[PDB]
């Protein structure tokens, strides 16, 4: 149906290249919490080449021309857009299957979220080399919604403690509930053939 990729710990182009391949193959991919996407190289280097992007402005009127987006949901969405054939109708239809959300909205906060170990910083960056966060390089360029997102992030996660608190309570029960067995005739085939 729809796959949900949590975006923290991921590199920008390593994640957006895989997402752009899946979206051409018919799937519907939703990249969620794209404030914490990383990008390799230190912060000042990634900050300079984004400011070099901002002055890519057409001279005669900048209203027509390059639309420099500032939220990191649209920083990511534009990176996917350059890895899709978007001037064709095959790639117009591709970018409609991608819905990228900054933060985690309530249709997608109670789903289970997936990661891509191809694009993780821990996997792919050597640990002694520097990386920049997509959140605060969005903050330094005109994205004015960092504080009101990170307030809603810690409101989301405190409610996400109280669910996981009572979910590990329930599996402490059904593992104490299976202490009193009375069913070992059914353990016989599973232990013999991988429980």
């Amino acid at each position: 149906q729809v796959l949900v990729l949590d975006g923290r710990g991921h590199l920008l182009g390593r994640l957006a290249a895989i997402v752009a391949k899946q979206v051409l193959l018919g799937r519907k991919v939703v990249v969620v919490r794209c404030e914490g996407i990383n990008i390799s190289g230190n912060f000042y280097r990634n900050k300079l080449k984004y400011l070099a992007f901002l002055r890519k402005r057409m001279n005669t009127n900048p209203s027509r021309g390059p639309y420099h987006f500032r939220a990191p949901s649209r920083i990511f969405w534009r990176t996917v857009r350059g890895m899709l054939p978007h001037k064709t109708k095959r790639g117009q239809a591709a970018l409609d299957r991608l819905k990228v959300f900054d933060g985690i909205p309530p249709p997608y906060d109670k789903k289970k979220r997936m990661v891509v170990p191809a694009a993780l910083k821990v996997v792919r960056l050597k640990p002694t080399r520097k990386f920049a966060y997509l959140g605060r390089l969005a903050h330094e360029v005109g994205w004015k919604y960092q504080a009101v997102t990170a307030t809603l992030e810690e409101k989301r996660k405190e409610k996400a403690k109280i669910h996981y608190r009572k979910k590990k309570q329930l599996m402490r029960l059904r593992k104490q509930a299976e202490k009193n067995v009375e069913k070992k005739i059914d353990k016989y085939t599973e232990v013999l053939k991988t429980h």
Binding site: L24, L25, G26, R90
Partner: protein, 109 residues
């Protein structure tokens, strides 16, 4: 009752970079992502099933809006679990990204 076929999406046609060849398709059969494990699917009949607004069946008692384009799996394509299939028409290019239907029929297992 249940699904007697394996899921596969239609990726495109056999192509270089500029020109493409329409007579052979290539498929991403699901769950196989290597060239060593694709040997099961060779020779399998596969189908693209779709809808129209006129009516046709072969046994089905009354013609419905469902119709099909048959074909079969020819060989493997690259190291990464892809598969090329030769149909009997060409795929309409409307089907890029949509699924096809890979059966189990000409089986040696």
């Amino acid at each position: 009752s249940g699904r007697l076929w394996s899921k596969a999406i239609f990726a495109g046609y056999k192509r270089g970079l500029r020109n493409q060849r329409e007579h052979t398709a290539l498929l991403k059969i699901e769950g196989v992502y290597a060239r060593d494990e694709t040997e099961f699917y060779l020779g399998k009949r596969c189908a693209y099933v779709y809808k129209a607004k006129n009516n046709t069946v072969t046994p089905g008692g009354k013609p419905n809006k469902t119709r099909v384009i048959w074909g079969k799996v020819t060989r493997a394509h690259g190291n990464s679990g892809m598969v090329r299939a030769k149909f009997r028409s060409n795929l309409p290019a409307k089907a890029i990204g949509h699924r096809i239907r890979v059966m189990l029929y000409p089986s040696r297992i």
